[PDB]
């Protein structure tokens, strides 16, 4: 037996019991909740659901602000063992004629002392323009698509190419989408974001997200996950008769 489980679970049951009483939850309402919970399980949506509403809060208490990069939620759509990307301009694996604007990402990884962290590896994943993640949609293959690991240069600089992510919506038709859209009368949209994980021997891992200035949902995240210090200027500076979105970010990691 776990005293953690005992202390937390006994309190949690008193809490929910008080809620039931306080709000006068009826037998039908209880059945609806019982049935709704079941359908989340049947839709495979527990990760998506809990992350949509609560991962922000678990994120808030776990990691702090300071002179390092702020973390943000991981969400449910991360995947391990993404391919190391090297070459000319290192580029995220992409379908032929992947919809979207070519995006060029630059920046660095350093420590709270300004030292470049050459040991780091940066996982990056993001949605297709369709608002889908590889491995997590029936409309996409279970293959590393718009996912990959990127490594800094000896000087600490990083650089990759992809399509610029655009906003997306949690399936309106799933139990999560239903709750957010019908039942609550809100939306199920997230602002556009690049997910990031950086790990380096000696440093605390960083899981974070990079957002874009002017994004329509910047102040309306259905998942409650945006943070001002992770909102990025976008530049557009043509390369031979081709317009590129330019995004730059310098990551600072904490020791230990």
């Amino acid at each position: 037996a776990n005293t953690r489980v005992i202390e937390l679970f006994d309190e949690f049951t008193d809490l929910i019991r008080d809620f039931i009483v306080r709000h006068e939850i009826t037998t039908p309402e209880y059945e609806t909740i019982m049935q709704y919970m079941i359908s989340v399980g049947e839709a495979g949506e527990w990760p998506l659901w809990l992350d949509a509403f609560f991962e922000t809060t678990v994120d808030s208490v776990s990691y702090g602000k300071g002179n390092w990069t702020s973390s943000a939620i991981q969400g449910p759509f991360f995947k391990e063992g993404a391919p190391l990307l090297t070459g000319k301009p290192a580029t995220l694996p992409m379908r032929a004629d992947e919809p979207g604007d070519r995006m060029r990402f630059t920046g660095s990884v350093r420590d709270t002392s300004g030292t470049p962290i050459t040991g780091a590896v940066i996982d990056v994943w993001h949605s297709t323009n369709d608002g889908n993640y590889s491995f997590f949609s029936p409309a996409l293959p279970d293959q590393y698509l718009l996912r990959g690991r990127v490594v800094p240069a000896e000087d600490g600089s990083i650089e990759f190419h992809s399509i610029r992510p655009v906003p997306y919506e949690i399936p309106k038709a799933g139990p999560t989408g239903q709750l957010m859209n019908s039942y609550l009368g809100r939306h199920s949209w997230r602002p556009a974001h690049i997910h990031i994980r950086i790990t380096a021997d000696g440093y605390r891992p960083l899981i974070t997200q990079l957002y874009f200035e002017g994004d329509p949902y910047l102040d309306s995240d259905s998942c409650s996950a945006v943070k001002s210090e992770l909102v990025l200027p976008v530049n557009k500076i043509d390369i031979d008769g081709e317009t590129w979105q330019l995004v730059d970010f310098n990551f600072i990691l904490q020791h230990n």
Copy 2:
């Protein structure tokens, strides 16, 4: 109900986040909760889990005490369309030599004033000596056994014969059982009971349970479903060879 799910959900959301913050639920803890929630779904256990922990409460909101017969939790094991019995001794359907002590039940269905409610139909269901309900066990036929419907005599009184229900265990190896037995370090035993549902034209439906004096689990019910007003004096008679156990209860109902 758009407006009503908005109130409860937002309130629920604040409740859980506040819980997450105060107890500082970590990423690993959160992932464990998430895994457990999936567990319960992959078993057929949401109804069993919710009824075990929270139906006691939904119950005490739906009915409330008085000179009524005090209600009780239904549980996940009720079956609609049980057989209407009219034998002269009047017996629940059971297999030949159904193990366990024989039991005779008597009582009444009167209203508050004491006028017998002739239009009553009473569903009664309970476990085998082995701790299984028909329809909910491979060791039992998917047929009505220890399940039945009884109609009162025109003076109110009711009688049926059966076997004595005994304390049963919610399965040790299930996510719920695991929670009750392993992580919480308690037990998953319910005290002995007979389930009862009463319907009457122009009267409020009553769902409840009858327990037995002396039961080892009367004060440690795994489902917190016991009410002292609903535990029965049990007179133990030995009609040689076969030891009958006689019980009596007078059901009072509310009415529109």
